[PDB]
Amino acid sequence: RSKDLRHAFRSMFPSSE
Numbered sequence: 539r540s541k542d543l544r545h546a547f548r549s550m551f552p553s554s555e
Contacts, residue, residue, distance in 0.1 A: 548554040
């Protein structure tokens with residue numbers, strides 16, 4: 539979704555990585 543696209547920003551962080 540267009541709102542879920544904001545969750546992709548976390549992938550850049552070390553928490554998601």
